[PDB]
């Protein structure tokens, strides 16, 4: 009953970790970590995440510094094979997980109505 | 392959629907839709929640007005037994839902944190 | 042009710090800092702020916890003095912000 | 030297900044061009999106990074947008300082 929920959650989990797209993102993270150059840009993009929370108090007008700074980081990612691999594999996975979400939480949607 | 992932996602939703906890929130939510006044407080509460979580991106505490508002909603909830039955029962369902979140969906998102 | 902006800015800054409403709030926050009991409730309440992020259906757990801190606040005089005063100040500040940034508003 | 007087004096100084004047000029020009205006409107909708994405703790994904990259190209390829985004950086320093100096010591 409760066991059903956790049995199915576990096998759904295992199944997703078996996807070539999961394998690829994880291997890609490991390759960023082994690479000085990739790793440094990743760590800085990570640190840039809080500048995005700044934005959303200080953001009625378009923030030109932010634009340039985010765009800069973008171009660094595109020019680094390890980083663009990570983000494109991550994106493919999040696409697939989003359709699984829809199935899994349909009984909850039924409760918002 | 992606077939068996879908089978597992479909099986997990069934389990959710099999939870007595799920069953109890569904009965509570319907009893609220039958009542025109519990619906209005419920509707009003939901808009108040989304007001609260707009403070999520300012990192500011809820002030005396939000506190005053929540006191009000809390009196309305406790003195309306359709509302109080739903709130008590949603808490019990909530644990399962956040467990599913945790086991299945959060890991892909964490790739970005 | 620039010096002007910076002088007016200084003047307004010192003016706001000299408002009785600003002082009332600073004195009330200091009183919390000096009361071991209020200090802890306040700290706890600060820590509940990461839970309104997690607020990413009505969350019953959240309403109860939030309702709970509200009552802890109304039950503590130092806390209920801080929040009341802080609100009075917030209305001034917001008035002033409207004036100062009206030229930016026109840009939107 | 009361607060309303200082706050009014301060906003009039803003109006007087060449940096302000240069941003108003570039916003109005943009207002009068359908091309530039829709990108502006879209960019702003996208800022909102970044802002809401923000609070999740995540990095912007490949898709957000690509949206940003698209807008970058559009701003750099459109003259009225280039003028605005450049003049906005310069004004931003003054707006920030006012925030820093006036408001955060009482908030």
Q: Give the DSSP per-residue string, D7-60.
A: HHHHHHHHHH-HHHHHHHHHHHHHHT-HHHHHHHHHHHHHHHHHHHHHTT-PPP
Tell me the torsion sign for CA atoms D96, D101, D103, D106. Answer: positive
Q: What angle do CA B66, B68, B69 make, to 5 degrees?
A: 60
List b or e across D80-97, with b for residues whose CB sees 16 or more CB atoms inside 10 angstroms. bbebbbebbbebbebbee
Gap sites in chain B (C to N > 2.5 Å), preceding residue numbers: none
> Partners for D (CB, 8 Å, 3+ pairs)?
A, B, C
CA-CA distance, B94 to A38, in Å (whole number)? 40
D85 Cβ contact partners less than 8 Å away, ≥ 6 residues apart: A62, A64, A67, A68, D75
3-state secondary structure of B7: helix
B24 Cβ contact partners less than 8 Å away, ≥ 6 residues apart: B89, B92, B93
| D57 Ramachandran zone, left/alpha/beta (phi>0; psi -120 to 50) | left
Chain B: residue whose CA lies nearest to C88: B64
Which candidate from D55, D58, D59 shows the least CB-CB separation from B57?
A: D55
Sequence length of chain A is 113
CA-CA distance, A96 to D8, in Å (whole number)? 55
**Read out DSSP for chain A?**
-HHHHHHHHHHHHHHHHTSHHHHHHHHHHHHHHH-HHHHHHHHHHHHHHHHHHHHTTS-SS--HHHHHHHHHHHHHHHT-HHHHHHHHHHHHHHHHHHHHHHHHTHHHHHHH-
C5 Cβ contact partners less than 8 Å away, ≥ 6 residues apart: D10, D13, D14, D17, D94, D98
Residues of D in contact with A91 (CB under 8 A): 61-63
CB D7 within 8 A of CB C96: yes
CA-CA distance, D39 to D32, in Å (whole number)? 13
Cα-trace Rg, chain C: 18
A75 Cβ contact partners less than 8 Å away, ≥ 6 residues apart: D69
Minimal C-alpha gap between C76 and chain B (Å): 14
The matching CATH number, chosen from 3.40.50.300, 1.20.1500.10, 3.40.50.10420, 3.20.190.10, for A1-113 is: 1.20.1500.10
Minimal C-alpha gap between A50 and chain C (Å): 14
CB A94 within 8 A of CB A21: no
Token pair belonging to D25? 């000029």
- The 10 Å Cβ neighbour count of residue B58 is 12
Minimal C-alpha gap between B4 and chain A (Å): 8
CA-CA distance, B27 to C13, in Å (whole number)? 57
CA-CA distance, B68 to D104, in Å (whole number)? 26
CB contact under 8 A, A91 and D63: yes
- The 10 Å Cβ neighbour count of residue D7 is 25
Query: Is C10 within 8 Å of chain B by CB?
Result: no
- The 10 Å Cβ neighbour count of residue D79 is 12
CATH 3.30.950.10 fits D1-107, yes or no: no
CB B36 within 8 A of CB C26: no
Query: Is B99 within 8 Å of chain C by CB?
Result: no
CATH 1.20.1500.10 fits C1-108, yes or no: yes
The residue ranges of every structural domain in chain A are 1-113
Dihedral pair phi/psi, residue D60, rounded to 5° = -50, 130
C107 Cβ contact partners less than 8 Å away, ≥ 6 residues apart: A61, D23, D24, D27
Long-range interactions of B14-20: CB distance < 8 A, separation 24+: B14/A4, B14/A8, B15/A1, B15/A4, B15/A5, B15/A7, B15/A8, B16/A5, B16/A104, B16/A107, B16/A108, B16/B96, B16/B100, B17/A107, B18/A1, B18/A4, B18/A5, B19/A1, B19/A2, B19/A5, B19/B93, B19/B96, B20/A1
CB D77 within 8 A of CB D35: no
CA-CA distance, D22 to A108, in Å (whole number)? 52
Q: Tell me the H-state helices in chain B.
A: 2-18, 20-34, 36-54, 64-78, 81-100, 106-110
DSSP B103: I
CA-CA distance, B75 to C86, in Å (whole number)? 25
Tell me which method was used to determine the 3D structure: X-ray
- The 10 Å Cβ neighbour count of residue A73 is 19
Query: Is A107 within 8 Å of chain B by CB?
Result: yes
CA-CA distance, C21 to B81, in Å (whole number)? 42
Return the closest-CA partner of residue D24 out of D78, D87, D77, D79.
D87
Q: Most distant CA pair in chain D: distance in Å?
A: 53
List b or e across A32-67, with b for residues whose CB sees 16 or more CB atoms inside 10 angstroms. beebeebeebbeebeebbeebbebbeebebbbbebb
Return the closest-CA partner of residue B89 out of B32, B47, B44, B11.
B32
CB D20 within 8 A of CB C103: yes
Q: What is the resolution of this structure in A?
A: 2.4
Token pair belonging to A70? 């985010």
């Amino acid at each position: 009953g409760m066991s059903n929920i956790y049995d199915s959650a576990n096998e759904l989990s295992r199944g997703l970790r078996g996807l070539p797209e999961y394998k690829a993102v994880k291997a890609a993270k490991d390759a960023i970590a082994a690479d000085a150059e990739a790793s440094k840009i990743f760590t800085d993009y990570l640190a840039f995440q809080e500048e995005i929370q700044k934005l959303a108090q200080t953001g009625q007008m378009p923030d030109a510094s932010f634009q340039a700074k985010m765009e800069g980081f973008g171009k660094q990612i595109q020019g680094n094979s390890l980083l663009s691999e990570f983000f494109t594999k991550q994106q493919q996975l999040a696409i697939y997980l989003s359709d699984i979400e829809k199935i899994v939480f349909e009984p909850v949607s039924e409760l918002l109505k």
